[PDB]
Structure 1
Amino acid sequence: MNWTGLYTLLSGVNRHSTAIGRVWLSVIFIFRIMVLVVAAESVWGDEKSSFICNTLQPGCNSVCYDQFFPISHVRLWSLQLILVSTPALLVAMHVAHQQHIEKKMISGTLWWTYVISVVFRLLFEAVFMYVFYLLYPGYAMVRLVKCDVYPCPNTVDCFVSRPTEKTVFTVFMLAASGICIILNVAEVVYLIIRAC
């Protein structure tokens, strides 16, 4: 493994991307992947097993955990990474297919599809940011929550596992997503300006 191969793999074979999406976006993507890898198994490993409520009612822990955590942060970020990386994979596959078909026997089409893929990537980033805002208003996570879902009688106190570490990693991931959004917008603007 060399640098000239890793850089080519990350950038794809596309020849229209500038240094914003070729030197900076790949680095932020690697940063997000590494943070998700080092945080998924350790911090969020026992989010449900150590989630306890102050009640004797059977089945209250599971219903309260599902009520307060419809989909955990780790899985939300994994889905966000997959959806954000899908258009880049599509562009790389399309470039490879065009190279194959020209070998066995255009620039504007590649430029347009790259612009469309960057727009879709920005749209996915914004959609996942909005979903995270809807599900979990506020970056901070609290230690104690009040759960009144059936079958829990009245309202019970349930305790979250590692609120502070999860808050730190949430801040990191949200900052990385914001940087990605800014870089995508800058890339779109630069391409439009240079094309005109």
Structure 2
Amino acid sequence: STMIGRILLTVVVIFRILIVAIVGETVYDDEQTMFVCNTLQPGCNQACYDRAFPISHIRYWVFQIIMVCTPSLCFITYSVHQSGISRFYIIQVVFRNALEIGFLVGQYFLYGFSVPGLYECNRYPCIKEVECYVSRPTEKTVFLVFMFAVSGICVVLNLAELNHLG
């Protein structure tokens, strides 16, 4: 039972990396070029876009992907320099669990579960409140849901292994 867990964890990790690397960068290419607001004021588009999307999804996902694989690099470097291993194993497993749970919660609190098509903006220099229109909301919603599902699976597997070792 615990034999297949490692295989499934590795396959899920590789799948997530490949999906993020091959396709993600071209959905978000024209995010700001195709953002439009109903106004004649110079500088309102910049402020309203910056308020609507403080950090892009793809930047967050790349950062998370790189950060969640650091314990393995530390373990490999330690083993290479050596050339209490179980203590290092346990510590790295715990750290991986904590990092993954933290990142999942942060994603939920940053983005939610959908991308709406309209936005209401009231930042200077825009006069009172204006309405702005988003590009490709449906595809971005699908991406959000898919990423959340994959991260949940990863968390479940890590908890399973942690409870297996005891």
TM-score normalised to the size of structure 1? Answer: 0.79
Q: What corresponds to 2:7 in structure 1? A: 23
The SS at the match of 1:42 is: helix
Cα distance, 1:19 vs structure 2:
4.4
Letter in 2 for 1:65: Y
Q: Which among 51, 60, 69 is matched to residue 44 of structure 2?
A: 60
Contact conserved, 1:51 with 1:159, CA < 8 A, in 2?
yes
Which ranges of structure 1 fall in alignment gaps of 5 or more residues? 1-16, 101-108
Q: What corresponds to 1:70 in structure 2? A: 54
The SS at the match of 2:99 is: helix
Which ranges of structure 2 fall in alignment gaps of 5 or more residues? none
Q: What corresponds to 2:109 in structure 1? A: 134
Contact conserved, 2:25 with 2:58, CA < 8 A, in 1?
no
Question: How many residues of Structure 1 are paired with residues of Structure 2 in the alignment?
Answer: 165
Query: Residues 96-117 of structure 1, C-alpha deviation per residue, up to 9 Å, x if partnerless?
Result: 222x2xxxxxxxx222212211
Q: Which among 114, 119, 122 is matched to residue 94 of structure 2?
A: 119
Letter in 2 for 1:46: D
The SS at the match of 2:26 is: coil
Contact conserved, 1:53 with 1:158, CA < 8 A, in 2?
yes
The SS at the match of 1:146 is: strand
Say yes or no: does 1:83 pair with 2:57. no
Letter in 2 for 1:141: V
The SS at the match of 1:154 is: coil
Cα distance, 1:180 vs structure 2:
0.7
How many percent of aligned residue pairs carry the same amino acid? 48
Q: Which among 28, 48, 52 is matched to residue 44 of structure 1?
A: 28
Contact conserved, 2:43 with 2:125, CA < 8 A, in 1?
yes
Contact conserved, 2:118 with 2:134, CA < 8 A, in 1?
yes
TM-score normalised to the size of structure 2? Answer: 0.92
Contact conserved, 1:141 with 1:166, CA < 8 A, in 2?
yes
Query: Residues 141-187 of structure 1, C-alpha deviation per residue, up to 9 Å, x if partnerless?
Result: 11101011111111111111111101111111111111111111111
Q: What corresponds to 1:106 in structure 2? A: none
Say yes or no: does 1:35 pair with 2:19. yes
Q: Which among 60, 81, 85 is matched to residue 97 of structure 1?
A: 81
Letter in 2 for 1:151: P
Q: Which among 142, 160, 163 is matched to residue 186 of structure 1?
A: 160
**2: CA distance between counterparts of 1:191 and 1:169?**
34
Runs of 4+ in 1 over 3 A off after TM superposition: none
Q: Which has the larger radius of gyration?
A: 1
Cα distance, 1:39 vs structure 2:
3.1
**2: CA distance between counterparts of 1:177 and 1:62?**
32
**2: CA distance between counterparts of 1:38 and 1:161?**
20
Aligned-residue RMSD, C-alpha: 1.6
Q: What corresponds to 1:151 in structure 2? A: 125
Cα distance, 1:91 vs structure 2:
1.4
The SS at the match of 1:41 is: helix
The answer to which of 48-57 and 172-181 deviates more is 48-57
